[PDB]
Amino acid sequence: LKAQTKTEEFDAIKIALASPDMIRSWSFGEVKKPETINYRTFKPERDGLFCARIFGPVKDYECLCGKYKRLKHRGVICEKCGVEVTQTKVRRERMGHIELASPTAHIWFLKSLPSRIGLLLDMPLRDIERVLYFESYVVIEGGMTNLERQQILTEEQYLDALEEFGDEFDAKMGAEAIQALLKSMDLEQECEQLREELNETNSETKRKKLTKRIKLLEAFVQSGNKPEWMILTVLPVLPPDLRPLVPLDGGRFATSDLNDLYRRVINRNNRLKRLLDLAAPDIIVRNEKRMLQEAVDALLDNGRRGRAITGSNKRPLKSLADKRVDYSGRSVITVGPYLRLHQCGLPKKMALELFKPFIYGKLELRGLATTIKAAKKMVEREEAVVWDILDEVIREHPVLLNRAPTLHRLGIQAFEPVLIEGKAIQLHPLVCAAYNADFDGDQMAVHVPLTLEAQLEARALMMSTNNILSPANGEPIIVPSQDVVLGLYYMTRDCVNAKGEGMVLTGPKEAERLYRSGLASLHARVKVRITEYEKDANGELVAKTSLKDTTVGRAILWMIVPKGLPYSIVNQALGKKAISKMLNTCYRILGLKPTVIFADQIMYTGFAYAARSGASVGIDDMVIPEKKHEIISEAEAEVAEIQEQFQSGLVTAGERYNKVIDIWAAANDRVSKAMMDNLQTETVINRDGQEEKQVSFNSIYMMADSGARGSAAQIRQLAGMRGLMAKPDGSIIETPITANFREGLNVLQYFISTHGARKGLADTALKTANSGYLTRRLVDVAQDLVVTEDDCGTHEGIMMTPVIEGGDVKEPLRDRVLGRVTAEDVLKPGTADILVPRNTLLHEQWCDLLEENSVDAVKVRSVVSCDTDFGVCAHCYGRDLARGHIINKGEAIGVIAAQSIGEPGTQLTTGGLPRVADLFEARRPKEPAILAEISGIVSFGKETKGKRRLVITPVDGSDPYEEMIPKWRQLNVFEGERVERGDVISDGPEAPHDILRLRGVHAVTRYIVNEVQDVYRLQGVKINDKHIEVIVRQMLRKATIVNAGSSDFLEGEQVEYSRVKIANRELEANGKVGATYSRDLLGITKASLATESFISAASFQETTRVLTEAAVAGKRDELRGLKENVIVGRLIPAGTGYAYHQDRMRRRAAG
Amino acid sequence: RSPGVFFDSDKGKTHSSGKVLYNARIIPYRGSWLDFEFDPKDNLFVRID
Amino acid sequence: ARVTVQDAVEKIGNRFDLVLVAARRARQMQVGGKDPLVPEENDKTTVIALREIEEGLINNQILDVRERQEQQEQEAAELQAVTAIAEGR
Amino acid sequence: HARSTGSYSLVTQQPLGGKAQFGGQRFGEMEVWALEAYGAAYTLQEMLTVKSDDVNGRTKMYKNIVDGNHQMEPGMPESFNVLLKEIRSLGINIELEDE
Amino acid sequence: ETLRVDPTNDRLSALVEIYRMMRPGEPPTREAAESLFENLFFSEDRYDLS
Amino acid sequence: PQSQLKLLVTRGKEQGYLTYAEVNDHLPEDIVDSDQIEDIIQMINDMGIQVMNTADEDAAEAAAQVLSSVESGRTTDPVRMYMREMGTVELLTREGEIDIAKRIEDGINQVQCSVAEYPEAITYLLEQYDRVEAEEARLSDLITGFVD
Ligand SMILES: [Mg+2]
Ligand SMILES: [Zn+2]
Ligand SMILES: [Zn+2]
């Protein structure tokens, strides 16, 4: 079958140099005149920057002169002025050209610091430029006489050399010279010489540059490009519609600067033609040629040179080198607690305007409207019927909600529209956590999933209820926020004595019946008969009932708790954490739907009982310690004691300072732990006896304790004194703020407080941008990484143990191994007993079985060790997602990894967020420790010059290794003792490169993850090891070959490519010629630099250099990646489109 | 910044030597700036603007 | 409405293939070549297709079989028509 | 604010409010990452092709929307086409290979 | 030491180096160096501290 | 005692960072250009960046930078190269003008006399005037007038 010619769905893309004829191919005419339009009848002047003949008609299917105006005549070229009558859109398509009188250098190739003409000719830049401006001659193919080929001469020198040799010697100057140079150049011969010369002389300096240049040359050859094309003969002109002359109000016009530039180029070129026909002296024509070069250079890229300015406007004209979406909206948002988790309140008018086409279609579908026009007129009139029609089109049609600072994927969530009277969008409270959306006037945006696939994608993926879990860690993101948790807290709780204390009831029904009638208090100690279930039978619910000692409120709350959950979960005090673990267990036990509806009911009851609770905040609710004033007085004794000591000279200045600052710092803690006790347990009440005491029912304490809002620090600042403040210098004042917010703050105290406020605001505002930037670098380094294969089937993995830092368990084993697959079957303390067989996803039950037994460690498969090339297999990755099931095939994990790492990054403050940055960047620390290069006994050699050399002595092996260690740095290593490779030869931080090379891949992959996780966990942030492990996988992607037999020696190349080539070379081919390598750690920003697709790279990298460097190589972008397919505007090679791209990829490169 | 003469330091970061540095700057209401500045070699310099 | 696609995901495990297949079915119904396999509650073709996935009476295998059958349903019609095109000889 | 189908920019065809009828909301890179994190390709394609930058795709879609047929015949976004022309206007030859 | 790093010798030489520093690329002139340098900080027109 | 550009380089490397102002003055007196810096910040930035995070490769980012240091004279800006190129041509003397003009006269009169010595150059004019009086042409398109 004949392949194809006319437009199909294309694959890949190719970029290369353009031939003069190739350029003329695109051009449908030459633009010979600087003129644009006629100035009276605004029609385009023929063959000018704007032309109907060359480019296209000014109006659809209408000839310029107006001969053929009919839609019938089409392929007709008019006789008066040749214009094919066709849509005016082809004036946005057809290109043009200009035939340049003299050759002109292409400024991108001339100066883009790989000066391409230069390093292709092995000729320095200044020589090339000196030639181009006619400031000197350059030899070309000098033959056998006196002179080198690339050698440059001057006026006198050229004259003399010419007088000596008339022929068999050649020299030119200007653009023509460079062109002749390039054209004359034979790549083949140069290669043949370079190979021999490479082989003969042995020096690093020589053959390094030699091999680099031969590689460049052969690359350029295989490219298909020819050197001549670097020098411009024909200059293509951009279609007129892309540089519009379009009019405006008041008769004035407006136009692109490209018209000014192109006009300049055309004028100077024409003047050059004339000056050639007029036979001007050289001094003139040279100047005109230089001016033409300037004009063209300014036209292409005006960035370089002196930056020519547009007419009458100082601002430099924008040169060639130099998204809004329909069906959308936005507004201020409100609460709407009545909403179910799967829906959101959508304003009437908004939904009307948004679904307008749907409404038209449905309206004339049922027959309510004669035609579409009538439908428009109907909804424009807002006739009463259309509303009901809208209710039809809204029902099963989801909408997308989005907030401004989008970080993690939950930043956009799909809901089901519920028509609302008002202009505000009602957003479900439980989602307010995911969005990071307060109600202080934050606005949200709505989108409409037009296509069927978009509706189903919205419902099965982006839906609210389908994502109940943070992608960062398995913990529920639907956790009740504030009012609700204060509700369940006030509900589930007990005081010492209350109505119905001690009585007994048949069940929750009459418990609530007792409460609502005012007979029994919400919180009272009571024994009630409850029936709790358990699914502990195989796939089956077991029922049991008993007398539980609980409170009225907890009994009432139990009515909500579904099925197999134990009563024990609602028998606590019900804080935010317990109220979260409740939902979590509910999810890992009953499944999704029960968890959803449970969460809803929890919110409703929370708000209800919080409302009933009558919880408020008064000024007497914040209790200042009675002993505060006394503590103040005592520390104030300390300060004058130390003062009197400084006056007697017993203590120094700095010592006095530290002492006073310490005594105040202690005073703060004293007052704090006074007010805390007083605000905590001080309620003293009586049940049938004298007295007794319990946790206070005081409001603000309830808020802070439940987890609704407020915290011990802030409560500390309300009641007790607040801190010691520090100057902008960062020195901390030794006279702290003794007054608190409840008390009045005098002038000073406030003024000293202000700095802290502003530095606070500023720093937060800055860390916003920092977090964002980090997220950007992270998504750039990952992106295209997506689950591709299913199971790679490697036994390889990392050893998971609890962190055990200092004292007991800074993080457990169960957390680290949860949701992860086992590398190999692990064992009980006794063996021939396989509890967890081979590779099995370790879920809650499994991890609990591991917890039953005493197991201290589990080998776990990771994304960093996965044998799959160009991606990750689902088996290795893990489970975690919005769903508890194992990761789907085709889900893009790099994006969610980066998102999950960067989202909490706002909460981060060596240490802090810049520490995370430094870690991922692989940067060597300021004052690093040096590891032992090789095992064996060591000794200190030579003497002091800049360094004192350390000589290693391996037992069996040789000792060529001697490392020169600067001696002014105090050492560690024992000069009379043996040290293993990767031991401490000094203290201080260690470069991850060293950890990788000397210790191992798993060693460094552990170092990174543990360090960044130290940073996050120190700030109380949950991020699963997975994501960081994928970022690490991307960090170590490259490697440097050591041995040979296939590829070049020092080449940095993909571990995927390499391993693919050696595993392919271990069999067939040479028996094994397979080459060794060395894994290499690359910082995220550096690893991001490496991408196969040039369309992708042209995005985030420097555009000019990328396009050029790709163009000279004739690089063919096959797409295959996310970014490039986004740019080109087709289905992402992941997720829903993964099947497509799969299928197509298989159809391609095949029969 | 008020017109007049101004004496600054730029201690620390400059050339990471801890040797600090010292610079004077004459800022007119309207006109060219007259800058004087040292270097690690203790050689006084002057720059207009 | 269909609040949770968990069951539909349970049937066909990929969950993206869920969206793809359910899209195909929803298309079979939306521009009518066909009719629902489950009672329509006024649920749009989207939700109807999802329900059809839940009840296990719709999936890639089934749809492909049906379509491949229809190819021959139409092929049996044109059997005289296209064999009448012996003019190519 | 709300918009279904409004006016469009001349230079690059993109939604632009000219009547005080507002232009569509801007879909950013981070939002594209959000759609990328979800397995939703079609939502993204229709987001940056048919709903916005495709001069043919928008009308060809609208007719289907009113016809009662939810589909998309995406074609190529006008921005990347403009970029094809801008790159090709230089000495750079950019081609679309195969079939 | 500063004088030791001074490439110039007399008044005119210093004026040439200053003029070349301010407006490089173009040939210096005696009247140009004098005019410039006197017009910088010493002119009632081009300079005021008020 | 001399070679300039090494020092801003060798220092910029040892400090690990240099202010955007640090390179400007430390640059040799050779390259003063404004748009010069634009790509050299990228050059130093891929090998040890300070734009006030890079590639550890270095190597060729120095050899080419030195190639940019040798490329630091001719400031391009064709106004300059022109003004200088024409500035070479010597001024004319009042008599020299007469010399040159006389040479012109000799030349043009030579070619005119060479034309007059061609028989076909005569016959053509005759036939053309035969076309003029035949209303196949006009007097203005043949002669601009004789001497007169
Ligand atoms: Mg806010
Ligand atoms: Zn015509
Ligand atoms: Zn794997």
From Swiss-Prot, chain A:
SMART domains: RPOLA_N. The keyword Isomerase does not apply. Gene3D superfamilies: 1.10.132.30, 1.10.150.390, 1.10.1790.20, 1.10.40.90, 2.40.40.20, 2.40.50.100, RNA polymerase II, clamp domain, RNA polymerase Rpb1, domain 3. It catalyses: RNA(n) + a ribonucleoside 5'-triphosphate = RNA(n+1) + diphosphate. Signal peptide: none annotated. Binds 1 Mg(2+) ion per subunit. Binds 2 Zn(2+) ions per subunit. Changing residue 668 to D: Resistant to antibiotics salinamide A and B. It is an enzyme of class 2 (transferase). GO terms for cellular component: cytoplasm; cytosol; cytosolic DNA-directed RNA polymerase complex; membrane; transcription elongation factor complex. Mg(2+) binds at residues 438, 440, 442. Changing residue 736 to S/T: Resistant to antibiotics salinamide A and B. Changing residue 482 to P: Resistant to antibiotics salinamide A and B. Its cofactor is Mg(2+); Zn(2+). Changing residue 713 to T: Resistant to antibiotics salinamide A and B. Keywords: Acetylation, Antibiotic resistance, DNA-directed RNA polymerase, Magnesium, Metal-binding, Nucleotidyltransferase, Transcription, Transferase, Zinc. GO terms for biological process: bacterial-type flagellum assembly; bacterial-type flagellum-dependent cell motility; cell motility; cellular response to cell envelope stress; DNA-templated transcription initiation; intracellular iron ion homeostasis; nitrate assimilation; regulation of DNA-templated transcription elongation. Acetylated on several lysine residues in the presence of glucose. Belongs to the RNA polymerase beta' chain family. NCBIfam families: rpoC_TIGR. This is DNA-directed RNA polymerase subunit beta'. It comes from Escherichia coli (strain K12). The gene is rpoC.
Swiss-Prot record, chain C:
InterPro entries: DNA-dir_RNA_pol_omega, Pol_omega/Rpo6/RPB6, RPB6/omega-like_sf. GO terms for molecular function: bacterial-type RNA polymerase core enzyme binding; DNA binding; DNA-directed RNA polymerase activity. GO terms for cellular component: cytosol; cytosolic DNA-directed RNA polymerase complex; RNA polymerase complex; transcription elongation factor complex. Signal peptide: none annotated. It catalyses: RNA(n) + a ribonucleoside 5'-triphosphate = RNA(n+1) + diphosphate. Its EC number is 2.7.7.6. It comes from the Bacteria. The keyword Transcription applies. GO terms for biological process: bacterial-type flagellum assembly; bacterial-type flagellum-dependent cell motility; cell motility; cellular response to cell envelope stress; DNA-templated transcription initiation; intracellular iron ion homeostasis; nitrate assimilation; protein-containing complex assembly. Keywords: DNA-directed RNA polymerase, Nucleotidyltransferase, Transcription, Transferase. It is an enzyme of class 2 (transferase). The keyword Transcription applies. The RNAP catalytic core consists of 2 alpha, 1 beta, 1 beta' and 1 omega subunit. When a sigma factor is associated with the core the holoenzyme is formed, which can initiate transcription. The rRNA transcription and antitermination complex (rrnTAC) consists of RNAP, NusA, NusB, NusE (rpsJ), NusG, SubB, ribosomal protein S4, DNA and precursor rRNA; S4 is more flexible than other subunits. Belongs to the RNA polymerase subunit omega family. This is DNA-directed RNA polymerase subunit omega. It comes from Escherichia coli (strain K12).
UniProtKB/Swiss-Prot annotation, chain D:
It comes from Escherichia coli (strain K12). This is DNA-directed RNA polymerase subunit beta. Coiled coil: none annotated. The chain holds residues 1244 to 1342 of 1342 of the full protein. The lineage of its organism: Bacteria, Pseudomonadati, Pseudomonadota, Gammaproteobacteria, Enterobacterales. Co-administration of salinamide and rifampicin or salinamide and myxopyronin suppresses the emergence of resistance to both antibiotics. Acetylated on several lysine residues in the presence of glucose. DNA-dependent RNA polymerase (RNAP) catalyzes the transcription of DNA into RNA using the four ribonucleoside triphosphates as substrates. Resistance to the antibiotics salinamide A, salinamide B, rifampicin, streptolydigin, CBR703, myxopyronin, and lipiarmycin can result from mutations in this protein. It comes from the Bacteria. Belongs to the RNA polymerase beta chain family. The gene is rpoB. The RNAP catalytic core consists of 2 alpha, 1 beta, 1 beta' and 1 omega subunit. When a sigma factor is associated with the core the holoenzyme is formed, which can initiate transcription. The rRNA transcription and antitermination complex (rrnTAC) consists of RNAP, NusA, NusB, NusE (rpsJ), NusG, SubB, ribosomal protein S4, DNA and precursor rRNA; S4 is more flexible than other subunits. In pull-down experiments interacts with CedA.
Curated annotation (Swiss-Prot), chain F:
It comes from the Bacteria. Residues 1-63 are annotated as: Sigma-70 factor domain-1. It is found in: Cytoplasm. Belongs to the sigma-70 factor family. RpoD/SigA subfamily. Interacts transiently with the RNA polymerase catalytic core formed by RpoA, RpoB, RpoC and RpoZ (2 alpha, 1 beta, 1 beta' and 1 omega subunit) to form the RNA polymerase holoenzyme that can initiate transcription. Identified in a complex containing RpoD, the RNA polymerase subunits RpoA, RpoB and RpoZ, CRP and DNA. Interacts with Rsd; this prevents interaction with the RNA polymerase catalytic core and with promoter DNA, and as a consequence, promotes transcription from promoters that require alternative sigma factors. (Microbial infection) Interacts with Escherichia phage lambda antitermination protein Q. Contains 4 domains, connected by flexible linkers. In the active conformation, the domains are in an extended conformation, each making extensive interactions with the RNA polymerase catalytic core. In the autoinhibited state, sigma-70 factor domain-1 packs closely together with sigma-70 factor domains-2 and -4, contrary to the extended conformation that is seen when the protein is part of the RNA polymerase holoenzyme. This is RNA polymerase sigma factor RpoD. It comes from Escherichia coli (strain K12). The gene is rpoD. The chain holds residues 5 to 167 of 613 of the full protein.
